[PDB]
User: Fold this.
Amino acid sequence: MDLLAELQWRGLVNQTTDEDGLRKLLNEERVTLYCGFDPTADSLHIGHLATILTMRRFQQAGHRPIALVGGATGLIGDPSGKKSERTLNAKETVEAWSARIKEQLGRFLDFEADGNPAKIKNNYDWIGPLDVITFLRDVGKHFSVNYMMAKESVQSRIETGISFTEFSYMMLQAYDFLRLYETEGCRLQIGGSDQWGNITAGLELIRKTKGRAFGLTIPLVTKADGTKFGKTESGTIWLDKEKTSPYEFYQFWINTDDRDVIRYLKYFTFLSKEEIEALEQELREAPEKRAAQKTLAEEVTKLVHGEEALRQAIRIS
Amino acid sequence: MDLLAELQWRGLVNQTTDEDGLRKLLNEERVTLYCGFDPTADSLHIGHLATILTMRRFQQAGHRPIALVGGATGLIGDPSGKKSERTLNAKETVEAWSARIKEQLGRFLDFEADGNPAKIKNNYDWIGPLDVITFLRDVGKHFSVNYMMAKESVQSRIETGISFTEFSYMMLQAYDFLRLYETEGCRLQIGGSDQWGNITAGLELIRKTKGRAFGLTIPLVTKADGTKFGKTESGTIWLDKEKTSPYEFYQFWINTDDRDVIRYLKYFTFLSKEEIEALEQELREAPEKRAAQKTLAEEVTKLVHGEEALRQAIRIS
Assistant:
Protein backbone atom coordinates (compact mmCIF):
# COMPACT_ATOMS: atom_id res chain seq x y z
CA MET A 1 0.00 0.00 0.00
CA ASP A 2 2.35 2.71 1.25
CA LEU A 3 5.37 0.31 1.35
CA LEU A 4 4.57 -0.74 -2.23
CA ALA A 5 3.90 2.84 -3.30
CA GLU A 6 7.21 3.85 -1.79
CA LEU A 7 9.19 1.19 -3.65
CA GLN A 8 7.48 2.35 -6.77
CA TRP A 9 8.45 5.98 -6.13
CA ARG A 10 12.00 4.70 -5.61
CA GLY A 11 11.98 2.58 -8.75
CA LEU A 12 12.54 -0.82 -7.05
CA VAL A 13 9.53 -2.46 -8.76
CA ASN A 14 10.31 -4.00 -12.14
CA GLN A 15 7.38 -6.42 -12.23
CA THR A 16 4.79 -7.95 -9.95
CA THR A 17 2.60 -10.99 -10.42
CA ASP A 18 -0.55 -9.08 -9.12
CA GLU A 19 -0.03 -5.70 -7.60
CA ASP A 20 -3.46 -5.19 -6.02
CA GLY A 21 -3.53 -8.66 -4.47
CA LEU A 22 -0.03 -8.08 -3.05
CA ARG A 23 -0.75 -4.54 -1.86
CA LYS A 24 -3.83 -5.94 -0.12
CA LEU A 25 -2.02 -8.78 1.73
CA LEU A 26 0.92 -6.52 2.64
CA ASN A 27 -1.66 -4.17 4.17
CA GLU A 28 -3.55 -6.90 6.08
CA GLU A 29 -0.77 -9.22 7.37
CA ARG A 30 2.88 -9.76 8.34
CA VAL A 31 4.10 -11.25 5.10
CA THR A 32 6.87 -13.81 5.02
CA LEU A 33 8.95 -13.11 1.86
CA TYR A 34 12.29 -14.60 0.74
CA CYS A 35 15.14 -13.86 -1.67
CA GLY A 36 17.77 -16.43 -2.93
CA PHE A 37 21.57 -15.77 -3.17
CA ASP A 38 23.83 -18.32 -4.81
CA PRO A 39 27.49 -18.52 -3.85
CA THR A 40 29.21 -17.83 -7.16
CA ALA A 41 32.15 -16.23 -5.24
CA ASP A 42 33.47 -15.86 -1.67
CA SER A 43 31.71 -12.50 -1.34
CA LEU A 44 28.57 -10.74 -2.42
CA HIS A 45 29.10 -7.55 -4.44
CA ILE A 46 27.15 -4.31 -5.08
CA GLY A 47 25.11 -6.20 -7.71
CA HIS A 48 23.28 -7.78 -4.77
CA LEU A 49 22.68 -4.61 -2.72
CA ALA A 50 19.33 -3.69 -4.28
CA THR A 51 17.52 -6.94 -3.46
CA ILE A 52 19.26 -6.99 -0.05
CA LEU A 53 18.29 -3.47 1.05
CA THR A 54 14.87 -4.10 -0.47
CA MET A 55 14.51 -7.04 1.92
CA ARG A 56 15.40 -4.64 4.69
CA ARG A 57 12.79 -2.10 3.65
CA PHE A 58 10.25 -4.95 3.81
CA GLN A 59 11.44 -5.79 7.37
CA GLN A 60 11.17 -2.12 8.54
CA ALA A 61 7.52 -2.08 7.33
CA GLY A 62 6.80 -5.07 9.61
CA HIS A 63 7.36 -8.12 7.38
CA ARG A 64 9.47 -11.16 7.86
CA PRO A 65 12.45 -11.77 5.60
CA ILE A 66 14.15 -15.05 4.78
CA ALA A 67 17.58 -14.76 3.13
CA LEU A 68 18.15 -17.99 1.27
CA VAL A 69 21.71 -19.13 0.76
CA GLY A 70 21.95 -21.10 -2.45
CA GLY A 71 23.96 -24.11 -1.12
CA ALA A 72 22.25 -26.56 -3.48
CA THR A 73 21.54 -24.37 -6.54
CA GLY A 74 25.06 -22.82 -6.41
CA LEU A 75 26.03 -26.44 -7.37
CA ILE A 76 23.93 -26.35 -10.59
CA GLY A 77 23.98 -22.73 -11.70
CA ASP A 78 21.39 -20.25 -12.94
CA PRO A 79 21.61 -19.35 -16.66
CA SER A 80 19.39 -16.37 -15.84
CA GLY A 81 21.15 -13.19 -17.05
CA LYS A 82 24.06 -15.24 -18.32
CA LYS A 83 24.79 -15.40 -22.06
CA SER A 84 27.04 -18.37 -21.44
CA GLU A 85 27.09 -21.75 -19.80
CA ARG A 86 29.07 -21.51 -16.57
CA THR A 87 31.55 -23.92 -15.06
CA LEU A 88 30.52 -26.13 -12.23
CA ASN A 89 32.16 -25.22 -8.95
CA ALA A 90 33.01 -28.00 -6.50
CA LYS A 91 30.93 -28.77 -3.41
CA GLU A 92 33.94 -27.82 -1.23
CA THR A 93 34.18 -24.48 -2.93
CA VAL A 94 30.48 -23.71 -2.78
CA GLU A 95 30.23 -25.01 0.75
CA ALA A 96 33.01 -22.63 1.86
CA TRP A 97 31.60 -19.67 0.00
CA SER A 98 28.15 -20.24 1.52
CA ALA A 99 29.51 -19.68 5.06
CA ARG A 100 30.78 -16.18 4.22
CA ILE A 101 27.81 -15.10 2.16
CA LYS A 102 25.74 -16.15 5.15
CA GLU A 103 27.91 -13.74 7.18
CA GLN A 104 27.51 -10.69 4.92
CA LEU A 105 23.78 -11.37 4.55
CA GLY A 106 23.11 -11.14 8.30
CA ARG A 107 24.56 -7.61 8.41
CA PHE A 108 21.60 -6.15 6.59
CA LEU A 109 18.73 -7.82 8.57
CA ASP A 110 17.21 -7.74 12.05
CA PHE A 111 17.38 -10.82 14.23
CA GLU A 112 16.30 -9.18 17.51
CA ALA A 113 12.85 -8.06 16.44
CA ASP A 114 10.08 -10.23 17.91
CA GLY A 115 7.28 -10.88 15.43
CA ASN A 116 9.40 -10.30 12.34
CA PRO A 117 12.99 -11.41 12.94
CA ALA A 118 14.83 -12.70 9.87
CA LYS A 119 15.89 -16.23 9.03
CA ILE A 120 18.96 -17.16 6.92
CA LYS A 121 18.48 -20.57 5.33
CA ASN A 122 20.30 -22.97 2.97
CA ASN A 123 18.45 -24.93 0.28
CA TYR A 124 21.10 -27.64 0.62
CA ASP A 125 19.10 -28.83 3.64
CA TRP A 126 16.13 -29.90 1.53
CA ILE A 127 17.78 -30.31 -1.88
CA GLY A 128 20.92 -32.14 -0.71
CA PRO A 129 18.96 -35.17 0.45
CA LEU A 130 16.35 -35.39 -2.36
CA ASP A 131 16.59 -38.40 -4.67
CA VAL A 132 16.37 -37.93 -8.40
CA ILE A 133 13.27 -40.08 -8.80
CA THR A 134 11.36 -38.02 -6.25
CA PHE A 135 12.47 -34.84 -7.89
CA LEU A 136 11.48 -36.03 -11.34
CA ARG A 137 8.03 -37.18 -10.17
CA ASP A 138 7.07 -34.72 -7.42
CA VAL A 139 8.43 -31.63 -9.20
CA GLY A 140 8.93 -32.58 -12.80
CA LYS A 141 5.44 -33.95 -13.54
CA HIS A 142 4.10 -30.42 -12.98
CA PHE A 143 6.05 -28.84 -15.84
CA SER A 144 5.86 -29.33 -19.59
CA VAL A 145 9.08 -28.77 -21.61
CA ASN A 146 7.18 -26.15 -23.62
CA TYR A 147 6.41 -23.98 -20.57
CA MET A 148 10.09 -24.18 -19.61
CA MET A 149 11.54 -23.43 -23.11
CA ALA A 150 9.64 -20.16 -23.41
CA LYS A 151 11.36 -18.86 -20.27
CA GLU A 152 13.50 -15.83 -20.91
CA SER A 153 16.52 -17.56 -19.28
CA VAL A 154 16.27 -20.50 -21.69
CA GLN A 155 14.75 -18.88 -24.82
CA SER A 156 17.78 -16.63 -24.41
CA ARG A 157 20.15 -19.57 -24.91
CA ILE A 158 19.22 -22.60 -27.11
CA GLU A 159 21.26 -21.55 -30.18
CA THR A 160 23.86 -20.26 -27.78
CA GLY A 161 23.37 -23.68 -26.13
CA ILE A 162 22.46 -24.79 -22.61
CA SER A 163 23.01 -28.09 -20.86
CA PHE A 164 20.21 -30.07 -19.25
CA THR A 165 21.90 -29.07 -15.89
CA GLU A 166 21.24 -25.33 -16.26
CA PHE A 167 17.90 -25.95 -18.04
CA SER A 168 16.67 -27.68 -14.83
CA TYR A 169 17.90 -25.04 -12.44
CA MET A 170 14.42 -23.47 -12.60
CA MET A 171 12.79 -26.60 -11.13
CA LEU A 172 15.06 -26.31 -8.00
CA GLN A 173 14.21 -22.62 -7.39
CA ALA A 174 10.53 -23.61 -8.10
CA TYR A 175 10.89 -26.18 -5.36
CA ASP A 176 12.46 -23.77 -2.89
CA PHE A 177 9.39 -21.44 -3.15
CA LEU A 178 7.09 -24.41 -2.45
CA ARG A 179 9.03 -25.68 0.58
CA LEU A 180 9.25 -22.21 2.12
CA TYR A 181 5.60 -21.55 1.30
CA GLU A 182 4.86 -24.76 3.23
CA THR A 183 7.23 -24.63 6.22
CA GLU A 184 7.50 -20.88 6.65
CA GLY A 185 4.22 -19.55 5.32
CA CYS A 186 6.26 -17.79 2.59
CA ARG A 187 3.93 -15.73 0.35
CA LEU A 188 6.28 -13.53 -1.53
CA GLN A 189 9.47 -14.10 -3.39
CA ILE A 190 11.60 -11.13 -4.58
CA GLY A 191 14.64 -11.09 -6.87
CA GLY A 192 16.45 -9.06 -9.45
CA SER A 193 15.07 -8.49 -12.93
CA ASP A 194 16.28 -11.72 -14.37
CA GLN A 195 14.58 -13.90 -11.79
CA TRP A 196 11.07 -13.31 -13.26
CA GLY A 197 10.91 -16.74 -14.93
CA ASN A 198 12.27 -18.65 -11.91
CA ILE A 199 9.78 -16.94 -9.57
CA THR A 200 6.79 -17.53 -11.83
CA ALA A 201 8.04 -21.18 -12.01
CA GLY A 202 7.65 -21.40 -8.16
CA LEU A 203 4.19 -19.89 -8.57
CA GLU A 204 3.36 -22.51 -11.20
CA LEU A 205 4.51 -25.21 -8.86
CA ILE A 206 2.55 -23.91 -5.80
CA ARG A 207 -0.55 -23.37 -7.90
CA LYS A 208 -0.36 -26.92 -9.32
CA THR A 209 0.33 -28.58 -5.95
CA LYS A 210 -2.08 -26.61 -3.79
CA GLY A 211 -4.44 -24.64 -5.98
CA ARG A 212 -2.23 -17.24 -2.98
CA ALA A 213 1.39 -16.13 -3.44
CA PHE A 214 3.26 -13.39 -5.27
CA GLY A 215 6.50 -12.49 -6.99
CA LEU A 216 8.21 -9.10 -7.28
CA THR A 217 11.36 -8.28 -9.25
CA ILE A 218 13.68 -5.34 -8.80
CA PRO A 219 14.96 -3.64 -12.00
CA LEU A 220 18.46 -3.78 -13.34
CA VAL A 221 20.30 -0.69 -11.99
CA THR A 222 20.97 1.79 -14.82
CA LYS A 223 23.74 4.29 -15.66
CA ALA A 224 22.85 7.40 -17.77
CA ASP A 225 25.92 6.71 -19.94
CA GLY A 226 24.59 3.25 -20.87
CA THR A 227 27.42 1.28 -19.26
CA LYS A 228 27.05 -1.62 -16.80
CA PHE A 229 26.33 -0.60 -13.20
CA GLY A 230 29.21 -1.66 -10.97
CA LYS A 231 31.56 -2.26 -13.88
CA THR A 232 34.72 -0.52 -12.69
CA GLU A 233 38.24 -0.40 -14.08
CA SER A 234 39.28 -1.76 -10.72
CA GLY A 235 36.95 -4.79 -11.24
CA THR A 236 34.06 -5.63 -8.82
CA ILE A 237 33.14 -3.58 -5.80
CA TRP A 238 32.82 -6.34 -3.19
CA LEU A 239 31.07 -6.14 0.20
CA ASP A 240 34.10 -7.87 1.78
CA LYS A 241 36.31 -5.12 3.18
CA GLU A 242 39.31 -7.36 2.47
CA LYS A 243 38.57 -7.49 -1.23
CA THR A 244 37.35 -3.88 -1.58
CA SER A 245 38.42 -1.65 1.27
CA PRO A 246 36.01 0.77 2.86
CA TYR A 247 38.06 3.59 1.25
CA GLU A 248 37.59 2.14 -2.28
CA PHE A 249 33.91 1.27 -1.50
CA TYR A 250 33.47 4.91 -0.45
CA GLN A 251 35.28 6.33 -3.48
CA PHE A 252 33.15 4.30 -5.84
CA TRP A 253 29.93 5.98 -4.52
CA ILE A 254 31.55 9.39 -4.24
CA ASN A 255 32.34 9.16 -8.00
CA THR A 256 28.63 8.72 -8.89
CA ASP A 257 27.88 10.73 -11.99
CA ASP A 258 25.49 13.64 -11.42
CA ARG A 259 23.14 11.87 -13.86
CA ASP A 260 22.88 8.78 -11.60
CA VAL A 261 23.17 10.05 -8.06
CA ILE A 262 19.44 10.74 -7.56
CA ARG A 263 18.37 7.26 -8.81
CA TYR A 264 21.04 5.67 -6.55
CA LEU A 265 19.94 7.56 -3.42
CA LYS A 266 16.42 6.17 -3.89
CA TYR A 267 17.63 2.66 -4.54
CA PHE A 268 20.40 2.32 -2.02
CA THR A 269 19.54 4.59 0.90
CA PHE A 270 17.06 4.98 3.76
CA LEU A 271 16.77 8.80 3.18
CA SER A 272 13.16 10.04 3.00
CA LYS A 273 11.48 11.36 -0.10
CA GLU A 274 11.74 14.83 1.27
CA GLU A 275 15.47 14.35 1.99
CA ILE A 276 16.06 12.90 -1.47
CA GLU A 277 14.08 15.78 -3.10
CA ALA A 278 15.95 18.41 -1.20
CA LEU A 279 19.23 16.82 -2.49
CA GLU A 280 17.79 16.98 -5.98
CA GLN A 281 17.35 20.75 -5.73
CA GLU A 282 20.86 21.09 -4.20
CA LEU A 283 22.28 19.16 -7.20
CA ARG A 284 20.48 21.58 -9.48
CA GLU A 285 21.68 24.66 -7.67
CA ALA A 286 25.18 23.64 -6.53
CA PRO A 287 26.51 20.65 -8.46
CA GLU A 288 30.19 21.30 -7.78
CA LYS A 289 29.60 20.90 -4.03
CA ARG A 290 28.76 17.22 -4.55
CA ALA A 291 26.33 16.96 -1.61
CA ALA A 292 24.19 14.16 -3.15
CA GLN A 293 27.43 12.23 -3.86
CA LYS A 294 28.80 12.48 -0.28
CA THR A 295 25.43 11.59 1.33
CA LEU A 296 25.17 8.51 -0.86
CA ALA A 297 28.77 7.50 -0.10
CA GLU A 298 28.32 7.94 3.68
CA GLU A 299 24.92 6.21 3.86
CA VAL A 300 25.92 3.17 1.84
CA THR A 301 29.38 2.80 3.45
CA LYS A 302 27.81 2.93 6.93
CA LEU A 303 25.18 0.39 5.89
CA VAL A 304 27.76 -2.04 4.63
CA HIS A 305 30.81 -1.36 6.68
CA GLY A 306 29.59 0.75 9.64
CA GLU A 307 30.57 4.20 10.97
CA GLU A 308 34.17 3.59 12.04
CA ALA A 309 34.87 2.09 8.65
CA LEU A 310 33.28 5.25 7.12
CA ARG A 311 35.32 7.49 9.43
CA GLN A 312 38.51 5.95 8.11
CA ALA A 313 37.38 6.19 4.52
CA ILE A 314 36.72 9.85 5.07
CA ARG A 315 39.98 10.60 6.85
CA ILE A 316 41.85 8.50 4.27
CA SER A 317 40.26 10.63 1.49
CA MET B 1 29.70 -61.75 -38.72
CA ASP B 2 27.57 -64.86 -39.16
CA LEU B 3 25.39 -64.05 -36.08
CA LEU B 4 24.87 -60.53 -37.46
CA ALA B 5 24.31 -61.81 -40.99
CA GLU B 6 21.77 -64.25 -39.63
CA LEU B 7 19.78 -61.60 -37.77
CA GLN B 8 19.81 -59.61 -40.95
CA TRP B 9 18.47 -62.55 -42.97
CA ARG B 10 15.78 -62.87 -40.30
CA GLY B 11 14.95 -59.16 -40.32
CA LEU B 12 15.82 -58.44 -36.65
CA VAL B 13 18.15 -55.52 -37.51
CA ASN B 14 16.40 -52.16 -37.77
CA GLN B 15 19.46 -50.00 -37.18
CA THR B 16 23.00 -50.24 -35.89
CA THR B 17 25.38 -47.56 -34.73
CA ASP B 18 28.33 -49.09 -36.78
CA GLU B 19 27.80 -52.45 -38.34
CA ASP B 20 31.40 -53.27 -39.30
CA GLY B 21 32.78 -52.26 -35.90
CA LEU B 22 30.12 -54.41 -34.20
CA ARG B 23 30.53 -57.36 -36.55
CA LYS B 24 34.26 -57.18 -35.84
CA LEU B 25 33.97 -57.18 -32.02
CA LEU B 26 31.26 -59.86 -32.06
CA ASN B 27 33.71 -61.96 -34.10
CA GLU B 28 36.71 -61.33 -31.81
CA GLU B 29 35.23 -61.42 -28.27
CA ARG B 30 32.47 -62.54 -25.88
CA VAL B 31 30.38 -59.41 -25.93
CA THR B 32 28.39 -58.32 -22.92
CA LEU B 33 25.12 -56.79 -24.23
CA TYR B 34 21.98 -55.69 -22.32
CA CYS B 35 18.32 -54.90 -22.98
CA GLY B 36 15.98 -52.88 -20.62
CA PHE B 37 12.36 -53.88 -19.70
CA ASP B 38 10.20 -51.51 -17.71
CA PRO B 39 7.36 -52.84 -15.58
CA THR B 40 4.35 -51.12 -17.11
CA ALA B 41 2.18 -54.16 -16.14
CA ASP B 42 2.37 -57.36 -14.05
CA SER B 43 3.40 -59.35 -17.12
CA LEU B 44 5.40 -58.99 -20.28
CA HIS B 45 3.47 -59.56 -23.52
CA ILE B 46 4.29 -60.70 -27.08
CA GLY B 47 5.43 -57.13 -27.84
CA HIS B 48 8.57 -58.00 -25.87
CA LEU B 49 9.30 -61.40 -27.45
CA ALA B 50 11.47 -60.12 -30.30
CA THR B 51 14.07 -58.34 -28.16
CA ILE B 52 13.91 -61.24 -25.66
CA LEU B 53 14.51 -64.07 -28.15
CA THR B 54 17.07 -61.84 -29.84
CA MET B 55 18.95 -61.74 -26.53
CA ARG B 56 18.80 -65.51 -26.55
CA ARG B 57 20.19 -65.78 -30.07
CA PHE B 58 23.10 -63.61 -28.87
CA GLN B 59 23.65 -66.02 -25.91
CA GLN B 60 23.62 -69.14 -28.19
CA ALA B 61 26.37 -67.51 -30.33
CA GLY B 62 28.54 -67.22 -27.18
CA HIS B 63 27.76 -63.75 -25.80
CA ARG B 64 26.68 -62.64 -22.39
CA PRO B 65 23.24 -61.16 -21.89
CA ILE B 66 22.05 -58.83 -19.15
CA ALA B 67 18.27 -58.46 -18.83
CA LEU B 68 17.66 -55.16 -17.12
CA VAL B 69 14.50 -54.78 -15.08
CA GLY B 70 13.39 -51.17 -15.15
CA GLY B 71 12.74 -50.70 -11.38
CA ALA B 72 13.81 -47.05 -11.43
CA THR B 73 12.76 -45.96 -14.96
CA GLY B 74 9.36 -47.74 -14.64
CA LEU B 75 8.84 -44.95 -12.01
CA ILE B 76 9.39 -42.15 -14.58
CA GLY B 77 8.16 -43.58 -17.87
CA ASP B 78 9.47 -43.67 -21.43
CA PRO B 79 7.59 -41.46 -23.93
CA SER B 80 9.29 -43.49 -26.67
CA GLY B 81 6.60 -44.91 -28.97
CA LYS B 82 3.90 -43.27 -26.90
CA LYS B 83 1.76 -40.49 -28.42
CA SER B 84 0.60 -39.56 -24.94
CA GLU B 85 1.91 -38.70 -21.52
CA ARG B 86 1.41 -41.69 -19.24
CA THR B 87 0.29 -41.83 -15.63
CA LEU B 88 2.80 -42.38 -12.92
CA ASN B 89 2.48 -45.76 -11.26
CA ALA B 90 3.28 -46.05 -7.55
CA LYS B 91 6.54 -47.48 -6.22
CA GLU B 92 4.54 -50.33 -4.59
CA THR B 93 2.97 -51.17 -7.89
CA VAL B 94 6.17 -51.02 -9.90
CA GLU B 95 8.09 -52.82 -7.19
CA ALA B 96 5.58 -55.71 -7.30
CA TRP B 97 5.49 -55.86 -11.07
CA SER B 98 9.29 -55.96 -11.24
CA ALA B 99 9.40 -59.26 -9.30
CA ARG B 100 7.22 -61.06 -11.86
CA ILE B 101 8.81 -59.58 -14.94
CA LYS B 102 12.09 -60.77 -13.44
CA GLU B 103 10.48 -64.24 -13.34
CA GLN B 104 9.31 -64.35 -16.97
CA LEU B 105 12.63 -62.90 -18.16
CA GLY B 106 14.69 -65.74 -16.67
CA ARG B 107 12.73 -68.32 -18.68
CA PHE B 108 14.34 -67.25 -21.93
CA LEU B 109 18.04 -67.13 -20.81
CA ASP B 110 20.79 -69.50 -19.69
CA PHE B 111 22.14 -69.26 -16.18
CA GLU B 112 24.10 -72.54 -16.16
CA ALA B 113 26.52 -71.74 -18.95
CA ASP B 114 30.02 -70.94 -17.68
CA GLY B 115 31.65 -68.09 -19.60
CA ASN B 116 28.39 -66.55 -20.77
CA PRO B 117 25.65 -67.03 -18.17
CA ALA B 118 23.03 -64.28 -18.04
CA LYS B 119 22.46 -61.66 -15.37
CA ILE B 120 19.06 -60.11 -14.51
CA LYS B 121 19.52 -56.68 -12.95
CA ASN B 122 17.43 -53.77 -11.61
CA ASN B 123 18.39 -50.14 -12.27
CA TYR B 124 16.71 -49.24 -8.97
CA ASP B 125 19.96 -50.38 -7.33
CA TRP B 126 21.97 -47.52 -8.81
CA ILE B 127 19.20 -45.02 -9.59
CA GLY B 128 17.24 -45.40 -6.33
CA PRO B 129 20.07 -43.99 -4.24
CA LEU B 130 21.30 -41.20 -6.58
CA ASP B 131 20.76 -37.63 -5.40
CA VAL B 132 19.35 -35.06 -7.77
CA ILE B 133 22.38 -32.79 -7.60
CA THR B 134 24.71 -35.62 -8.61
CA PHE B 135 22.42 -36.58 -11.42
CA LEU B 136 22.14 -33.04 -12.69
CA ARG B 137 25.92 -32.51 -12.62
CA ASP B 138 27.40 -35.92 -13.45
CA VAL B 139 24.84 -36.78 -16.15
CA GLY B 140 23.13 -33.57 -17.09
CA LYS B 141 26.22 -31.45 -17.85
CA HIS B 142 26.92 -33.81 -20.76
CA PHE B 143 23.71 -33.03 -22.65
CA SER B 144 22.46 -29.85 -24.29
CA VAL B 145 18.66 -29.33 -24.44
CA ASN B 146 19.01 -29.05 -28.23
CA TYR B 147 20.49 -32.55 -28.61
CA MET B 148 17.64 -33.90 -26.48
CA MET B 149 14.78 -32.02 -28.25
CA ALA B 150 15.69 -33.44 -31.65
CA LYS B 151 15.17 -36.97 -30.32
CA GLU B 152 12.39 -38.82 -32.07
CA SER B 153 10.70 -39.57 -28.70
CA VAL B 154 10.54 -35.87 -27.82
CA GLN B 155 10.31 -34.21 -31.27
CA SER B 156 7.32 -36.53 -31.54
CA ARG B 157 5.59 -34.80 -28.61
CA ILE B 158 6.14 -31.06 -27.83
CA GLU B 159 2.87 -29.81 -29.38
CA THR B 160 1.26 -32.95 -28.07
CA GLY B 161 3.06 -31.97 -24.83
CA ILE B 162 5.52 -33.75 -22.55
CA SER B 163 6.40 -33.12 -18.93
CA PHE B 164 9.95 -32.54 -17.74
CA THR B 165 9.61 -36.04 -16.08
CA GLU B 166 9.28 -37.96 -19.37
CA PHE B 167 11.67 -35.55 -21.16
CA SER B 168 14.41 -36.66 -18.70
CA TYR B 169 13.76 -40.36 -18.97
CA MET B 170 16.47 -40.51 -21.64
CA MET B 171 19.16 -39.34 -19.18
CA LEU B 172 18.34 -42.34 -16.87
CA GLN B 173 18.60 -44.94 -19.68
CA ALA B 174 21.79 -43.04 -20.79
CA TYR B 175 23.09 -43.57 -17.29
CA ASP B 176 22.21 -47.26 -17.21
CA PHE B 177 24.38 -47.90 -20.34
CA LEU B 178 27.30 -46.11 -18.67
CA ARG B 179 27.06 -48.00 -15.36
CA LEU B 180 26.79 -51.37 -17.11
CA TYR B 181 29.58 -50.43 -19.49
CA GLU B 182 31.66 -49.73 -16.38
CA THR B 183 30.74 -52.55 -13.98
CA GLU B 184 29.92 -55.27 -16.49
CA GLY B 185 32.03 -54.44 -19.50
CA CYS B 186 28.75 -53.88 -21.41
CA ARG B 187 29.50 -53.00 -25.06
CA LEU B 188 26.20 -53.43 -26.74
CA GLN B 189 22.72 -52.31 -25.98
CA ILE B 190 19.75 -53.70 -27.97
CA GLY B 191 16.10 -52.60 -27.95
CA GLY B 192 13.03 -52.29 -30.08
CA SER B 193 12.74 -49.73 -32.86
CA ASP B 194 11.72 -46.88 -30.68
CA GLN B 195 14.72 -47.12 -28.39
CA TRP B 196 17.14 -45.67 -31.01
CA GLY B 197 17.30 -42.24 -29.35
CA ASN B 198 17.69 -43.61 -25.80
CA ILE B 199 20.52 -45.93 -26.89
CA THR B 200 22.39 -43.26 -28.82
CA ALA B 201 21.94 -41.09 -25.65
CA GLY B 202 23.90 -43.79 -23.66
CA LEU B 203 26.51 -43.72 -26.42
CA GLU B 204 26.71 -39.93 -26.12
CA LEU B 205 27.18 -40.25 -22.41
CA ILE B 206 29.90 -42.98 -22.61
CA ARG B 207 31.71 -41.10 -25.36
CA LYS B 208 31.67 -37.86 -23.33
CA THR B 209 32.76 -39.51 -20.06
CA LYS B 210 35.39 -41.88 -21.41
CA GLY B 211 36.21 -40.98 -24.98
CA ARG B 212 33.96 -48.30 -28.13
CA ALA B 213 30.31 -49.38 -27.74
CA PHE B 214 27.36 -50.08 -30.00
CA GLY B 215 23.59 -50.00 -30.26
CA LEU B 216 21.27 -52.24 -32.27
CA THR B 217 17.49 -51.89 -32.63
CA ILE B 218 15.01 -54.53 -33.68
CA PRO B 219 12.23 -53.43 -36.09
CA LEU B 220 8.59 -53.05 -35.26
CA VAL B 221 6.87 -56.36 -36.16
CA THR B 222 4.63 -55.91 -39.22
CA LYS B 223 1.32 -57.39 -40.41
CA ALA B 224 0.63 -57.56 -44.20
CA ASP B 225 -2.85 -56.10 -43.56
CA GLY B 226 -1.34 -52.98 -41.97
CA THR B 227 -2.81 -53.54 -38.50
CA LYS B 228 -0.90 -53.51 -35.19
CA PHE B 229 0.99 -56.73 -34.40
CA GLY B 230 -0.46 -58.33 -31.28
CA LYS B 231 -3.61 -56.22 -31.39
CA THR B 232 -6.30 -58.85 -30.81
CA GLU B 233 -10.03 -58.58 -30.18
CA SER B 234 -9.31 -60.48 -27.01
CA GLY B 235 -6.84 -57.72 -25.93
CA THR B 236 -3.11 -58.45 -25.22
CA ILE B 237 -1.48 -61.82 -25.59
CA TRP B 238 0.42 -62.02 -22.28
CA LEU B 239 3.31 -64.35 -21.39
CA ASP B 240 1.60 -65.07 -18.05
CA LYS B 241 -0.37 -68.29 -18.51
CA GLU B 242 -2.88 -66.97 -15.97
CA LYS B 243 -3.68 -63.94 -18.08
CA THR B 244 -3.47 -65.68 -21.48
CA SER B 245 -3.72 -69.43 -21.26
CA PRO B 246 -1.42 -71.66 -23.25
CA TYR B 247 -4.46 -72.62 -25.37
CA GLU B 248 -5.18 -68.95 -26.28
CA PHE B 249 -1.41 -68.26 -26.72
CA TYR B 250 -1.33 -71.23 -29.10
CA GLN B 251 -4.45 -70.19 -31.00
CA PHE B 252 -3.10 -66.71 -31.55
CA TRP B 253 -0.03 -68.10 -33.45
CA ILE B 254 -2.05 -70.77 -35.22
CA ASN B 255 -4.23 -67.95 -36.66
CA THR B 256 -1.20 -66.25 -38.29
CA ASP B 257 -2.18 -65.01 -41.71
CA ASP B 258 -0.42 -66.77 -44.59
CA ARG B 259 1.06 -63.35 -45.46
CA ASP B 260 2.83 -63.08 -42.06
CA VAL B 261 3.74 -66.60 -41.08
CA ILE B 262 7.13 -66.66 -42.85
CA ARG B 263 8.28 -63.33 -41.30
CA TYR B 264 7.14 -64.59 -37.86
CA LEU B 265 9.01 -67.91 -38.11
CA LYS B 266 12.24 -65.97 -38.73
CA TYR B 267 11.60 -63.54 -35.93
CA PHE B 268 10.22 -65.79 -33.25
CA THR B 269 11.70 -69.24 -33.81
CA PHE B 270 15.00 -71.14 -33.63
CA LEU B 271 14.25 -73.02 -36.93
CA SER B 272 17.15 -72.94 -39.42
CA LYS B 273 17.13 -71.08 -42.70
CA GLU B 274 16.75 -74.33 -44.51
CA GLU B 275 13.81 -75.32 -42.26
CA ILE B 276 12.18 -71.92 -42.72
CA GLU B 277 12.70 -72.09 -46.53
CA ALA B 278 11.27 -75.54 -46.78
CA LEU B 279 8.15 -74.24 -44.92
CA GLU B 280 7.99 -71.41 -47.42
CA GLN B 281 7.72 -73.86 -50.32
CA GLU B 282 5.13 -75.94 -48.37
CA LEU B 283 3.05 -72.76 -47.87
CA ARG B 284 3.24 -72.17 -51.61
CA GLU B 285 2.28 -75.71 -52.52
CA ALA B 286 -0.17 -76.64 -49.74
CA PRO B 287 -1.54 -73.59 -47.94
CA GLU B 288 -4.68 -75.25 -46.59
CA LYS B 289 -2.55 -77.71 -44.60
CA ARG B 290 -1.27 -74.86 -42.42
CA ALA B 291 2.14 -76.43 -41.70
CA ALA B 292 3.99 -73.09 -41.24
CA GLN B 293 1.20 -72.00 -38.83
CA LYS B 294 1.38 -75.14 -36.62
CA THR B 295 5.22 -75.12 -36.49
CA LEU B 296 5.18 -71.48 -35.40
CA ALA B 297 2.48 -72.16 -32.79
CA GLU B 298 4.33 -75.20 -31.35
CA GLU B 299 7.79 -73.57 -31.33
CA VAL B 300 6.68 -70.35 -29.67
CA THR B 301 4.33 -72.04 -27.15
CA LYS B 302 7.11 -74.43 -26.10
CA LEU B 303 9.54 -71.52 -25.78
CA VAL B 304 7.23 -69.57 -23.55
CA HIS B 305 5.20 -72.17 -21.77
CA GLY B 306 7.06 -75.47 -22.34
CA GLU B 307 6.03 -78.83 -23.86
CA GLU B 308 3.37 -79.99 -21.39
CA ALA B 309 1.67 -76.63 -21.72
CA LEU B 310 1.84 -77.12 -25.54
CA ARG B 311 0.50 -80.68 -25.21
CA GLN B 312 -2.56 -79.36 -23.44
CA ALA B 313 -3.06 -76.57 -25.92
CA ILE B 314 -2.99 -79.13 -28.68
CA ARG B 315 -5.32 -81.60 -27.01
CA ILE B 316 -7.61 -78.72 -25.99
CA SER B 317 -7.75 -77.62 -29.68
